[PDB]
Amino acid sequence: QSACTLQSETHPPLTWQKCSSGGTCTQQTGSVVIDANWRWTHATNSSTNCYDGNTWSSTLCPDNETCAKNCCLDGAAYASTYGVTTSGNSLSIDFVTQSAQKNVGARLYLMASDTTYQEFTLLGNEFSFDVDVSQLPCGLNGALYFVSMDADGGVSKYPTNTAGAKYGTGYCDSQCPRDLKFINGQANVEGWEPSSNNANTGIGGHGSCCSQMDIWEANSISEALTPHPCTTVGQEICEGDGCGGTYSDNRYGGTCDPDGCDWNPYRLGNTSFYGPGSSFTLDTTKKLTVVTQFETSGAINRYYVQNGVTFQQPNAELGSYSGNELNDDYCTAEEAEFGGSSFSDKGGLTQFKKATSGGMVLVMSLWDDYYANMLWLDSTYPTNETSSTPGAVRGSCSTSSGVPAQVESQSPNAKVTFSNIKFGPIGSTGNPSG
């Protein structure tokens, strides 16, 4: 797709700190850009939509190539249309915003310039950030993660995409998402099937795969840390059900691991560590600091800070595994106790290390789940299982929670605020900001 300018594109600025092993941090100035799926896609020569509701224009988009040729992505009114605002080192995303039409959340990428994404090499470094999840009830997910996306949004590899990072193109993740309207400079109209429950969405014949480091997926009830390896490290297109993931019938018939080696303290047995109020170690009604370290062995460490008190990731005992570090022994023990082979089938942490060794783009989003109501994160899943089933209970939310239409109606003013991002060598982000 190309870019159009009926509506100006002004990326909300966002600063972050780059820290050094020497003990000092220096402020960096970037900005955020919303994913292309949220935008108005219209004809290059008029205001006629190429996509509207849950269907593509049969005339403007008779096939993937013709569609990309005739269509362009336009600018976004961040605050008024998408409820996305920034202030210094803080970024806030509202759940439901009402303008000409209704909008639910957003998926944003941190930029290096107005036309390129910022890339981060996680291996040997640590990433720190503050987050307020107080306004995130059951069924919602304020996520902060990294994916192996191209810095230009795919423009160099696919010339028919001239919109680029400036218009949030090029997304990919471990689900090999097939809901994306444009992949590899072509539309996804071929094989398009509208969603049963989401008026704005559908599933196309193509998906976009790549490694994903889910640093944070959480609400005020539950939180999870999850690395997801793929046989192909970076962005790569996939065909239909061979994509696997959430958008396919068979989630494991692809190149990426859709489950990952997840670490949810509650799921692992510590039901008193993270939650709303003073009865939890970390009180989710208040802002907290989350630090994630990627040691060169490929293992991942984690600690939190709230009110000046530091807490390492709680210890967990699963099978023969015991400790608080997410390493090979943990991931293997998890598959043994909870079940599954997706993570190891895709290469485990060794394969995942190939992603953290290279550059990855920072993503910040707020979403509700039209496929599983976020039950996998904060409730019992599958819903017919009990606490006797290993790993089934992940949170205290009712198995009836998270219906998108219900939560959007009941908690429209829900939101998430990510702030004070700091990145640098392990042991450096806790030093004074510049």
Ligand X SMILES: OC[C@H]1O[C@@H](O[C@H]2[C@H](O)[C@@H](O)[C@H](O[C@H]3[C@H](O)[C@@H](O)[C@H](O[C@H]4[C@H](O)[C@@H](O)[C@H](O[C@H]5[C@H](O)[C@@H](O)[C@H](O)O[C@@H]5CO)O[C@@H]4CO)O[C@@H]3CO)O[C@@H]2CO)[C@H](O)[C@@H](O)[C@@H]1O
Ligand Y SMILES: *[C@@H]1O[C@H](CO)[C@@H](O)[C@H](O)[C@H]1NC(C)=O
Ligand Z SMILES: OC[C@H]1O[C@@H](O[C@H]2[C@H](O)[C@@H](O)[C@H](O[C@H]3[C@H](O)[C@@H](O)[C@H](O[C@H]4[C@H](O)[C@@H](O)[C@H](O)O[C@@H]4CO)O[C@@H]3CO)O[C@@H]2CO)[C@H](O)[C@@H](O)[C@@H]1O
Q: Contact residues for ligand X (CB under 6 A)?
A: 37-38, 40, 49, 51-52, 81, 99-101, 103-105, 107, 143, 173, 175, 177, 179, 200-201, 365, 367, 370
Q: Whole-angstrom Cα distance, residue 319 to residue 176?
A: 31
Number of residues that bind ligand Z (CB under 6 A): 19
What's the min distance (Å) between Cβ of 311 and ligand Y?
Answer: 5
* CB 162 within 8 Å of CB 154: no
Residue nearest to ligand Y (CB): 314
* CB 128 within 8 Å of CB 423: yes
What track of x and - describes contact with ligand Z for positions 392 through 411 (by CB under 6 A)?
x-------------------
For residue 290, what are the contacts with CB-CB under 8 A and spacing of at least 6?
128, 129, 130, 131, 215, 216, 302, 304
Q: Is 77 in the site for ligand Z (CB under 6 A)?
A: no
What residues numbered 370-399 form the site for ligand Y, per CB under 6 A?
382, 384-385
**Residue of 300, 299, 294 whose CA lies nearest to 358:** 294
What's the min distance (Å) between Cβ of 143 and ligand X?
Answer: 5
Q: Which two tokens stand for residue 89?
A: 């080192």
Nearer to ligand Y, 232 or 281 (CB): 281
Angle between helices 328-338 and 348-356 (to 10 degrees): 130
Q: Identify which range of 10-18, 76-84, 377-385, 418-426 contacts ligand Z by CB under 6 A.
A: 377-385
Report the partner that residue 49 touches, choosing among ligand X, ligand Y, Co ion, none (CB closer than 5 to 8 A by kind). ligand X
A 10 A CB-CB count for 124 gives 13
Q: Is 311 in the site for ligand Y (CB under 6 A)?
A: yes
Report the partner that residue 338 touches, choosing among ligand Z, ligand X, ligand Y, none (CB closer than 5 to 8 A by kind). ligand Z
Q: Are strands 193-194 and 202-203 parallel, antiparallel or unpaired?
A: antiparallel
Q: Residue numbers of the site for ligand Y (CB under 6 A)?
A: 270, 272-273, 281, 311, 314, 382, 384-385
Q: Residue numbers of the site for ligand Z (CB under 6 A)?
A: 175, 214, 217, 226, 246, 258-260, 262, 338-340, 376, 381-382, 385, 389, 391-392
Q: Residue numbers of the site for Co ion (CB under 5 A)?
A: 295, 299
